[PDB]
Design a protein around this ligand. Sequence first.
Ligand SMILES: O=C(O)CN(CCN(CC(=O)O)CC(=O)O)CC(=O)O
Ligand SMILES: [Fe+3]
Length: 308
Amino acid sequence: DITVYNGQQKEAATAVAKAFEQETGIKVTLNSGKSEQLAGQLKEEGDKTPADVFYTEQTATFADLSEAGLLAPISEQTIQQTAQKGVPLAPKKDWIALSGRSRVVVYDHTKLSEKDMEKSVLDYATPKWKGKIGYVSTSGAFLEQVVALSKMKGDKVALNWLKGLKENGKLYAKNSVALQAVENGEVPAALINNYYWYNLAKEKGVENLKSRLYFVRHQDPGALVSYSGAAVLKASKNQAEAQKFVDFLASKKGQEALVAARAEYPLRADVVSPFNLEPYEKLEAPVVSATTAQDKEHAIKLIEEAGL
Ligand SMILES: O=C(O)CN(CCN(CC(=O)O)CC(=O)O)CC(=O)O
Ligand SMILES: [Fe+3]
């Protein structure tokens, strides 16, 4: 049996842990928390950690741990199972990306069509979209988007985008609220993440929704994907089962379990999501370095400078 420090949404983690317990008979104990906190705890615990695996919604949180020498290598063969072009790879082969969440534009298809959409996320923050674009400045993925803009286009472009949203956008407290605002006709489009919409569509039926999704693609900053993943702790005294679990997560079966539980894009190329997601490769996500604490601090400063 293994102990998994879990920064991923509890529902997803519970699902893969059960499919694992069923393929193998090995019990998983999930210890859930925020990935940044869990990473801090793993670093502090060091060679005395009881964690076998760290399962996260954000592979960026592995960087501090890898840099501290706290992660074990994963089999090359396992890493390759999800190594689609675009997918972040651990330079030390000491963690693996497993699935992704995407930025997206949700829009009310009774008011806008795909031909009205902007091909760059930068262009939603402009006067064409005055009063017409929702955004969620407190959201984690919004912050990731700002970080990506700063990295890809520079801080001035990122700040200008934020000021453009301040002037032209409608602020919503949460992605779910923004999605409902589009559905209810309050705003014709909003910047959210994919999984809110796919969840709503799965539950209610797309035939009963006014909203649709527009993906900018072509490695635009707005095609940003945030990657979930897993790592084995170097200090684990149960390497064999820890590795078995990570191997399972990258297996067809483990990926099938994840995608049934949460509308993340699987990174295997032979798994289709019951949420009816497009294949990961079609997203054309940009390649962006991992978000650091420093990156986040800088992005928060830009949000404040923009008046948000
Ligand atoms: O709790 C929230 O406010 C939204 N989140 C978690 C935050 N997000 C990113 C975002 O909504 O911007 C998912 C994640 O970071 O893993 C719950 C969910 O996505 O199910
Ligand atoms: Fe979310």
